[PDB]
Design a protein around this ligand. Structure first.
Ligand SMILES: O=c1ccn([C@@H]2O[C@H](COP(=O)(O)O)[C@@H](O)[C@H]2O)c(=O)[nH]1
Ligand SMILES: O=c1cc[nH]c(=O)[nH]1
Length: 190
């Protein structure tokens, strides 16, 4: 892998697509970790042959992960961590063992406060229309690099909602780099 996509999700937005049933994200007004996705030549590396997920390897990060990486769709964090490790983490296992991978994600989350970066610009989530360019600009100014903005469209209304913010990192997992790929259009609800 040559870079990482540190993907954070806005729980309420992610859960806003679940039109029925419980969804913990609905009550979590803080960006949380969706996953840390290794990339290679402009593409996501997934399902690489690697070590099976081992929950004991991250007991030391468990409390932090419960807060920073909760499963926002259902009350089962481990299932989500295991899925993210197996589908993505294995792809950077050449240099980051499971413990180091989850630690990277935790550190990245603790060093990439999106709400804190948007607050000064009154660009926090309020269910109103936001500019992709403006949001990327605020984050570019705060962190020095452009984030990636990911949106999902409500099939019934055609309204686009910001669901994830990506912080791109070099293979060292510490050097923030500019993201260039967004799934969001020029405007979206946040
Ligand atoms: O809080 C979350 C966010 C996403 N997912 C799940 O993870 C997958 C999306 O992540 P990915 O496979 O593209 O890494 C989907 O199956 C989705 O339901 C969860 O279980 N919990
Ligand atoms: O991780 C991802 C997802 C989509 N497209 C990419 O280039 N990387």
């Amino acid at each position: 892998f040559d870079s990482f996509w540190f993907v954070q999700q806005w729980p309420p937005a992610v859960c806003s697509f679940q039109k029925s049933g419980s969804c913990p994200g609905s009550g979590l007004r803080t960006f949380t970790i969706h996953g840390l996705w290794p990339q290679q030549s402009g593409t996501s590396l997934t399902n690489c042959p690697g070590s099976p997920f081992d929950i004991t390897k991250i007991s030391h990060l468990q409390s932090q992960l419960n807060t920073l990486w909760p499963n926002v769709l259902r009350a089962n964090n481990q299932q989500f961590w295991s899925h993210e490790w197996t589908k993505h983490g294995t792809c950077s296992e050449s240099t980051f063992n499971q413990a180091a991978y989850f630690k990277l994600a935790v550190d990245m989350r603790n060093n990439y406060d999106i709400i804190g970066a948007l607050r000064p610009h009154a660009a926090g989530p309020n269910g109103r229309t936001k500019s992709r360019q403006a949001i990327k600009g605020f984050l570019k100014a705060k962190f020095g690099k452009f984030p990636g903005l990911r949106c999902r469209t409500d099939p019934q209304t055609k309204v686009s909602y910001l669901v994830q913010v990506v912080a791109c990192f070099a293979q060292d997992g510490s050097t923030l780099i500019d993201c260039t790929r967004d799934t969001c259009g020029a405007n979206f609800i946040f």
